[PDB]
Amino acid sequence: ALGKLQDVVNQNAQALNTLVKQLSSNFGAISSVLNDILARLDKVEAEVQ
Amino acid sequence: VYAWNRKRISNCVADYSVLYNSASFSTFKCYGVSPTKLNDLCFTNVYADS
């Protein structure tokens, strides 16, 4: 019966799960992880990633 | 060069500055890493193809 209230909790959970999983995406960089880029490259090469 | 030789390197500490500071090397170009940074990094496998 409470499906109307549970749907609002489900949509807010899916919105944050999608927002947070997108931190693991590369978007075309050498790596998804920002500290790995900075621990591997100097400014002129790193800023493009 | 048609028969190029691979050495595996493991279970040791690598001061790469002993290499990249040597003026003997007429070429020293790096990809996906800067040689300046190698003194802090760690790796699963290292190979030397020669």
UniProtKB/Swiss-Prot annotation, chain A:
The residue stretches assigned to a coiled coil in this entry are: 6-49
Q: What is the effect of changing residue 11 to H?
A: In strain: Omicron/BA.1, Omicron/BA.2, Omicron/BA.2.12.1, Omicron/BA.2.75, Omicron/BA.4, Omicron/BA.5, Omicron/BQ.1.1, Omicron/XBB.1.5, Omicron/EG.5.1
State its role: Subunit of the fusion protein that is processed upon entry into the host cell. Mediates fusion of the virion and cellular membranes by functioning as a class I viral fusion protein. Contains a viral fusion peptide that is unmasked after S2 cleavage. This cleavage can occur at the cell membrane by host TMPRSS2 or during endocytosis by host CSTL. In either case, this triggers an extensive and irreversible conformational change that leads to fusion of the viral envelope with the cellular cytoplasmic membrane, releasing viral genomic RNA into the host cell cytoplasm.
Recorded protein name is Spike protein S2'
| Top-level taxonomy | Viruses, Riboviria, Orthornavirae, Pisuviricota, Pisoniviricetes
